[PDB]
Amino acid sequence: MNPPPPETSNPNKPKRQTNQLQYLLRVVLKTLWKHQFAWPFQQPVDAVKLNLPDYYKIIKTPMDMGTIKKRLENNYYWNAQECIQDFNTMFTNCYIYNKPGDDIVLMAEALEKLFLQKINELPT
């Protein structure tokens, strides 16, 4: 089966709204979300549907833009670096499970370059 998805709320984790975190939701995520290659990354990997039964044997810290989106909307993060780390976990998972040249990797490679472009400059 699929594992439980990552948490999107945690009452005992301190929350914070920063200008940078508002920007990561309004501009960075919500623009990557519209990319033609974004769809595989908008929800946790459904290893059952995709017939990838070894996915969660290999990936032990799953992450996806659907989870990141809910975390941003729920003010789950303390700072932008926490959210950026989640993006990097998602890309890294993709490169770990898959191989250079795979369709999914070409998609992640493209999103990651766009992600890096958008976060090169954050609001102050």
**110 binds ligand ECU per the rule CB under 6 A:** no
The distance of closest approach from Cβ of residue 97 to ligand ECU in the complex, given in angstroms and rounded to an integer, is 4
Q: Per CB under 6 A, which region of 13-21, 39-47, 80-88, 116-124 contacts ligand ECU?
A: 39-47
* The only residue of 25, 27, 38, 104 in contact with ligand ECU, by rule CB under 6 A: 104
Breaks (C-N over 2.5 A) in the chain follow: none
90 near ligand ECU (CB under 6 A)? yes
Rounded to a whole number of angstroms, the minimum distance from the CB of residue 26 to ligand ECU is 23
Does residue 58 interact with ligand ECU by CB under 6 A? no
Give Cβ neighbours of residue 66 (< 8 Å, ≥ 6 apart). Answer: 41, 42, 43, 44
Q: How many residues bind ligand ECU (CB under 6 A)?
A: 11
57-77 CB burial, b ≥16 within 10 A, e <16: eebeebbbbbbbbbbbeeebb
- What are the two backbone dihedrals, phi and then psi, of residue 12, each rounded to the nearest 5 degrees? -100, 5
> Residue 63 Cβ, how far from ligand ECU at the closest point, in Å?
7
User: Which ranges of the chain would DSSP assign to H, the alpha helix?
Assistant: 19-23, 30-32, 55-58, 65-73, 80-97, 103-119
Q: Can you give the binding site for ligand ECU, defined by CB under 6 A?
A: 40-41, 45, 50, 52, 90, 93-94, 97-98, 104
